[PDB]
C-alpha cells in the first residue's frame, strides 16, 4: 500500500511515486472531490470501481475527479491507460478530517527510461 | 490449481505462470474488481461463466475486469482467445480480506518459442 506523502504547505495535497506492483491508499472523506491527475499525454482506456454507485467519477482528458456518493464506500478503482494501470484503494473516512484534495504521481520509470 | 503468487510490495497484485493443463485459483472478495490482463496482441474470441449472473464481466481489448454480483458466487470462467484458453476458478471469499486487485500472467511458452 502506497500511502501518499503530504506537501509541506498543506496536508491536503499529496504525492506518491508510481510503482506498478503496489496500490495507492486514497482516504476519501465525505463531500470533497479528489483530483487525480495522470501523466501528460497518457491516454485513458478504461476504469473499474468496486462500486459504481459508491463513488462518482468524472474525467476530462487526464484529470480525474472522484467523490463518495454513499455510506461506507470502501472499494477499489483500477484506471487503465495506454502506458500503465493505476490501482487505488478508496477507503472512506468517517470523521471528515484529513481530506485529500489532490493526488499527484511521480513516475520513476519514465525518468529511468530517460536515463 | 495454480494459486497466484503475490508481489513483494502489495499482496493484492498477484502473478501466475500460464500452464495450458492447469486452472488458476482466483479469490474474489465482495465489492472489488479484479483486473485480469491477457497477453499483448492476443485476440479474445469468447468466454463462458458458470454463472452469468454471479459475476460481472467487462472487457476493453485485452483488459478484463470481473466483480462478484451475487452471494455464494462459486463458478468458473473460461476465456478463450486466438492463442490460448484461460481457465479460472472464481471462488468468492466470505470475510472480505485477502483481495486480488490484479492478476498478471507469465507465459513460458512464448519465451520457449523465442528460445
Amino acid at each position: 500500500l502506497d500511502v501518499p506523502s503530504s506537501s509541506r504547505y498543506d496536508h491536503r495535497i499529496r504525492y506518491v511515486t508510481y510503482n506498478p506492483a503496489d496500490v495507492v491508499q486514497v482516504d476519501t472523506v465525505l463531500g470533497v472531490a479528489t483530483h487525480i491527475m495522470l501523466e501528460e499525454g497518457e491516454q485513458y482506456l478504461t476504469h473499474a470501481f468496486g462500486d459504481s454507485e459508491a463513488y462518482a467519477f468524472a474525467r476530462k482528458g487526464r484529470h480525474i475527479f472522484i467523490k463518495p456518493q454513499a455510506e461506507l464506500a470502501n472499494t477499489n478503482l483500477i484506471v487503465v491507460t495506454d502506458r500503465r494501470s493505476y490501482k487505488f484503494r478508496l477507503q472512506m473516512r468517517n470523521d471528515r478530517n484529513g481530506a485529500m484534495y489532490e493526488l499527484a504521481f511521480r513516475y520513476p520509470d519514465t525518468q529511468a527510461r530517460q536515463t | 490449481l495454480d494459486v497466484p503468487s503475490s508481489s513483494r510490495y502489495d499482496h493484492r497484485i498477484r502473478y501466475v505462470t500460464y500452464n495450458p493443463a492447469d486452472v488458476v485459483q482466483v479469490d474474489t472478495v465482495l465489492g472489488v474488481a479484479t483486473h485480469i490482463m491477457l497477453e499483448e496482441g492476443e485476440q479474445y474470441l469468447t468466454h463462458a461463466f458458470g454463472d452469468s449472473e454471479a459475476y460481472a464481466f467487462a472487457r476493453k481489448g485485452r483488459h478484463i475486469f470481473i466483480k462478484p454480483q451475487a452471494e455464494l458466487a462459486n463458478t468458473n470462467l473460461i476465456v478463450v482467445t486466438d492463442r490460448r484458453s484461460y481457465k479460472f476458478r472464481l471462488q468468492m471469499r466470505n470475510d472480505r480480506n485477502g483481495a486480488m486487485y490484479e492478476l498478471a500472467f507469465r507465459y513460458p511458452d512464448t519465451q520457449a518459442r523465442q528460445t
Partner: peptide
C-alpha cells in the same frame, strides 16, 4: 436493514462502470 446490510446490497447491485 442495518447500514452494513444496505452497503452489502449496494455492492452486489452496482455495475463496474456507471453509465
Amino acid at each position: 436493514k442495518t447500514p452494513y446490510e444496505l452497503a452489502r446490497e449496494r455492492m452486489l447491485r452496482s455495475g463496474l462502470t456507471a453509465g
